[model samples]
Target: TPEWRKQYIQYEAFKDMLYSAQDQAEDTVKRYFAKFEEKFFQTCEKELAKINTFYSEKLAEAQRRFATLQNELQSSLDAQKESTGFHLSHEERVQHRNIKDLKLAFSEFYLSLILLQNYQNLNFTGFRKILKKHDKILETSRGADWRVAHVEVAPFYTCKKINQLISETEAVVTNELEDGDRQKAMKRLRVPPLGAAQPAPAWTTFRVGLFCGIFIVLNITLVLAAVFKLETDRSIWPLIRIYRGGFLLIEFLFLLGINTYGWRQAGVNHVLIFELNPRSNLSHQHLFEIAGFLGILWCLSLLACFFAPISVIPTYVYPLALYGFMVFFLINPTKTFYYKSRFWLLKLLFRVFTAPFHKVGFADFWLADQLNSLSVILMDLEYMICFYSLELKWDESKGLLGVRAIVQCIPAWLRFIQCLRRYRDTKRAFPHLVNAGKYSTTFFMVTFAALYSTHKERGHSDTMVFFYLWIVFYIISSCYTLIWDLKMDWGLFDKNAGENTFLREEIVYPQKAYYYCAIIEDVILRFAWTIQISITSTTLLPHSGDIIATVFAPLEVFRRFVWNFFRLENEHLNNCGEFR
Candidate 1:
């Protein structure tokens, strides 16, 4: 205690200096806060005025934008084929599908706000009556849409009308006999935190979730497999670890490339990925779709790493890996960027892809049909993988997977079966299923390849046996998936594929099923991956080696020969076509 007082005295000057700096810092803070507080209150009063005026100005601006868009659309053509009678049976009118209705619906709040702002002059009953009247107009007129001229735009007809009403009301109450003494008042109202605790802006939650899903899951799986002592032999751990690491790296690469591409091309702007399915006539774009898709895959994959129990090749394994890519399926953002580029490169690539089916009819239509068929097949494949994953996991865990799957699937299956039946009952099957706007054959093969290549053996103690079996699995499964793609890719299944097509419009049918199935499949896949990492980590999925095994060496040579031959032919043909 005596030393403590001496020590304090020894640095008394230094302490004084620190105190002086602290005082200076506090003084600065106080000065700034004083200035800021004065301006903030001034701004708050101004902002309150702005907030009160926000709805009116926004309504007017939205109306003007809509009107301008409508006028621009006037010169365009509207040749939308009527929805099949089935859609009509639900009393779902198709016309009200434009962004303008969204604008108009929001406009009524301005009217209500004006009434509330002037509440000193009116009672609560009067306030309720005003809101009720405004809401009545909202309920009746601000929906669906009316087409002006030819192009379909949000006919904000009512927005303009609402503004008119606001103008008239404001005129009537212009300078009513009311003034308050100069007592400062700020209305303080507490709004409930949105949805849950740790209230985050939508974007922050999205980012955190995205990082958790893919990257974190992959990291845990790979790391656990790399380090764990399993029931099986330990020799394969090194390779498995490497593969898992490789996957995480590759996924990160893809994610980085895609996100950078989007940001560079679009600069944080919003774009729409319009689908023929979902809600047909109306589509709205939002920024979150991109962030949400990328983020959720990572999240789902993280779960799958721990929860899945499927052991079969190409069942649970493939779906989990593919789910990583499914994150990109948000709004067809890749194609969106390409379209936005509007460059010759993308157009040429598009033309080349479609060129194979040029003999059928229109190249675009044939390609679209092929793509749609592809979507149907891929959906089935993913759904199948999820089912098997859930079954295996459930079988092993006694209803855990089953309960999860049922919770995930039942409502969707019901909706899908009903939609499918509706398509059948109304004879609207062809175009509906053939229209694989978002659903298509784009990524299933890739997904299957990743899952199929990975190995998952639970109890075997022989590392050589497990490793060799995994090799066999990857090689055989890759060939199988490729062959499946070839077989299914030959024709549009929506046009003809037996019951295998699921329905004539199998691509987007079972819409709810696919939606829920995706989430389920992803969960199962990640869980299974987690189990494998827990077991042993010799590359469970396909890595680079299986393709060139001694038995497949001949096939590889032949494939290379075939590919080179086609490459030359295509190059020559393209040159010739250009010259011609």
Candidate 2:
């Protein structure tokens, strides 16, 4: 339960380690053993101590609970009857509810014991097997066999107290809680057998491939458009181009696919983390399949925009129709879309918009942060809306420039408000206020940039001040965020660099270089806005305007993609820590 796959023997790591560097000799396996001695034995000493303490502490906790309610009820569970019965008196309801409460605690206690049992199961099995591998591989080194012998003789194995406690608890639950049904009691008590060997069933792969292949045709069309300029530049079409759709498309289609698959491999239970329906969760395949459907339509919309002339029909309908259909499918009461997940998404969307009214949860703020990434597109909503009307009213749309903060900072403000609410709830403002500060920085960063632009044309002292202010905020925002991403969100940069270097001790990713590269990637992409259509930005690179949008948008999404990887791991560890 608590760091389940983690605390076990590094069975996975060891297997790969032994199989790795095929040229190495068993005699020089001394370095491998020596390296592991520094890491493995060092970690084992700490793990053994921690495991012993937690096991003892948890067992004592159960002992306390067992003593807390001794012989309180009898009759093979009179309480079970009351809990199931309807239309009870208020007094009866209170008594029934109390008994109901008692059962939850007991069930949780039972569940706890079940996990502890498996804790014994994995630690023993994994230890013996890996040591046996080590001994077999290395006729030169016998320390592994020696360690395995000690593991067999270990006090953890020697102790039979857990066996006694489980029997007492199970007997009490069977006869007393569920009324003499050992089968039902035991069924409820066991956590699970285990999980499947591999995930993502076959038909899903074929479907993903099919739709993505369709998408590839559309992708080539985009490539052709890039190869030969198809449309007049600076028309509204360029703004509403592939980068816009590609940002969201590749984000949902590719980056998010990478996200789920990475999390799957890393064993991050995002379904459980996000509290989605576990039985019918969206796998990596389903999401890409879903996105590719959108991806296909997105290109068709592009086709209409590019191939079909604006004079034929109002071309605005295409983008409108595309996203219109998206919203329609999202809100549709049909069975095709996963209504449960979609509705939950809609619910969180509402919660994000109505930020201060309702309390915040992880999904709410996570969705809000996504919006932070899309503030560019969100600010463009005005353009899209203006286009819907005589729409050519560029001058009138320019009027809202002064008040664009409302749209530009929507994501930041929601998160800032949530942090305020969190601070209110927790009465500890340091972390919450600190987090809010990070979001709030977006406000100043966007604002000063706008002001700098507004006055830059005039070249007033205010321009100097605003330009300096924008620089200050930009640096502050980037550095502040860079630190937060590295330290808080990522849960990396541990002082101890023995095994994993700057990464924490319990990283689930097999490739350590991925983390190091991601750190570099995030830092580089954090400043990508410089190349974007900034008022002060010079043309650092040669590109079409639409290309800027398409590239930087995904780069942001790519930042988010990598950001989510570590964030998922951090959260998974947090869950594991809570159980621990």
Candidate 3:
């Protein structure tokens, strides 16, 4: 990161120098105008030399990595040819994964090179703009001649070596990595088209609005039914909890949509960070559209749960139908509804749940942490299955000991296993083990919460012991996770942040207060566990004991939305290596 900071074209400095030169030349003699112009030109030439040096340095590195990768691929192919059977899908071979890793490495290095090209383009444009300003103010025509003499011929623009390198990289990526599928290879390697960067299209926005309107109308209908028609009783608690989880799950997505929208605006390359397909990844608008449609299903199904014709259809069928539709859409495998994106997520989820089997990527564990926040969803899933199995006249108690008690531990367990696997891979004891211990805290918290509930319900032992114990672990784990979020995950509170103070040096988002505000907001919300505890101890809070989670479940989701910005910004900065 410091390496990139060092090599970044001194654009700001050069522009500032131009202003200072203008101020100095303005108050002086008429003949001194040429003095400032030549001086600035000299500064430009010096910068040109620096830019050329960095360009060639990167060019040489990419050339080396590209060649080495190709050599490995060739060697693997030769070896496979010597004794291979089918070679089938490139699955189950260590060579295949190694080759894929090389492909990833190639992508990172090549993408960095492309970004450097962008740097050259940007800096060259700045130089020309400043030169045009010089010519305009001085009543001279040196700008065009200056561009011909210096800027055009400079290494950044001359394009001999980079052009050859680009063409060669394209060929290798096509023939070797993509099996001669130029279309597929180019699709993977090329940046998203300009249209992808544009705002959500009219059709998408209209559909989002359409779904949003339907979603709202259904919600209003639900409330009215609750107020005037349906009885809110224990008989419906299971369904209510399930749909509440459903909405919380749906709400989580649109928050991610909003977070990604902010990330896009602030220039965080989350598509790359998440390893998403740039061309077809769901933009923020699509995410909102999906969330709205899902919420429409959720509210409609919930309404049916309230007012279904019990004789014709069972009341429990509504929630299950909503779930089946949601699941079927994603797992449909048809050429519709963004299949690549859906499969990408499902694949990552598979990797996450099967944590020990595969390598832990950034996106994998990132989703695991998101699951950690949505323990309520996990619990509700267990509740749903258990309620359906245990059948009617249920009050969520059939799923208590066997379901909520263990489901709450799953996300943490997945993360714990992932930490061990990472530690096994890296052979590092510091981060993985320490981070593993963080998730380990959640197991105790879940246990004690279960214990507190059991003792409270049993009317036997003093529940205060389990409650205090749960509170202790709850405090420790939240503090631990919060510390990790700020110091490690977001990389804040740096000593060498230079001018950025508490934050890191290379923040993409320019609002200085945002970083600190995000920090404070994270801190406050980390301790939001207090809300439930306060409500538990007294009747002061608006929501009741069991229902207070209606407030906190989405708060956890919101905390995650806040978490997304900084996490991906950090990942984006990591991608800026050699090109920042």
Residue 72 shift from truth in candidate 1, angstroms:
32
Q: Alpha carbon lDDT of residue 201, candidate 2?
A: 67
Rank order by TM-score, top first? 3, 2, 1
Say which prediction, candidate 1 or candidate 2, comes out ahead on lDDT.
2
In candidate 1 the C-alpha lDDT for residue 472 amounts to: 55
Candidate 2 residue spans exceeding 4 A from truth: 1-202, 229-246, 309-312, 393-401, 459-462, 529-549, 574-580
Candidate 1 segments whose C-alpha is farther than 4 A from its true place:
1-206, 209-221, 230-580
TM-score for each of the candidates: 0.23, 0.61, 0.62
Q: Order of candidates by lDDT, top first?
A: 3, 2, 1
lDDT of 1 at 40: 31
User: Roughly what TM-score does model 2 have, to 2 decimal places?
Assistant: 0.61
RMSD of 3: 25.8
Question: lDDT for each of the candidates?
Answer: 0.33, 0.66, 0.72
Candidate 3: residue 579 lDDT (0-100): 18
Q: After superposition, how far is residue 408 of candidate 2 from its true place, in Å?
A: 1.4
Candidate 2 Cα deviation (angstroms), residue 199: 5.0
- Number of clashes recorded per candidate: 28, 1, 0
Provide the RMSD of all predictions against the true structure, rounded to 1 decimal.
Answer: 26.8, 26.4, 25.8
Candidate 2, residue 569: lDDT = 84
